[PDB]
Structure 1
Amino acid sequence: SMIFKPEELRQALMPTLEALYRQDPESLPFRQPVDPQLLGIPDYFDIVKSPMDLSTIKRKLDTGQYQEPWQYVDDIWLMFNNAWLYNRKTSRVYKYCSKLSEVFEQEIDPVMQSLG
């Protein structure tokens, strides 16, 4: 119920978002919505029911669609859990995801503390 100003959400969370984008090659599979046809994985939507990626998250931050920062956390973990569900433990994407998730856990905590 406590509502955060959309511009306070941007200044606080956008550095945490840049931290994942800057991971290269690990972030590349995550920067745009998964396109099953274009990638040749047409079973993707039979398995992933709520897709999510960095461009959608950033667009929500840019346009003030999050009311409080834990919705941002939600979308980021949903993005990770989607990739861990779909790709096999031995795939590059799966390990790319784990890297991104290590980057996120190491930097989100002081940011969420400052937001109160």
Structure 2
Amino acid sequence: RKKIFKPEELRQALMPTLEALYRQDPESLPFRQPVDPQLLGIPDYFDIVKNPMDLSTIKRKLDTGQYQEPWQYVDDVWLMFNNAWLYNRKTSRVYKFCSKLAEVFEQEIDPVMQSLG
């Protein structure tokens, strides 16, 4: 169950799954930068969402070797999705985009997680 990974090998394996999310347009656009509640006029955002996450943060973490094992990366992507599903209404554009991104990610990440072990 224990396994160590070289950060550079994780980067090469996982980065295509991240790039896949960025390539979804329009669906990735709400997720490319951290939610700024003041700028977006959603002042309750940080009361609802205790641990924000977005693609730019995940990309930086992947580039700077902050993921030592693949589930740490997967956890951040899922956190991003979970936050958007929590904060936004089911009828909303962002919620619907999130659901689409989650489908893309599942298809991308499963073969990678199999290959990494």
Unaligned runs of 5+ in 2: none
Identity %, equivalent residues? 96
Cα deviation for residue 4 of structure 1 reads: 1.0
Return the TM-score normalized by structure 2: 0.96
How many aligned positions are there?
A: 114
Alignment match, 2:101: 100
Deviations 1:25-73 (A, max 9, x none): 1101000000000111111001000000000011000000011000001
| In structure 1, C-alpha distance between the alignment counterparts of 2:90 and 2:63, rounded to whole Å | 33
Alignment match, 1:26: 27
Moved over 6 A (4+): none
Cα deviation for residue 13 of structure 1 reads: 0.3
Alignment match, 1:72: 73
Cα deviation for residue 15 of structure 1 reads: 0.3
Return the TM-score normalized by structure 1: 0.96
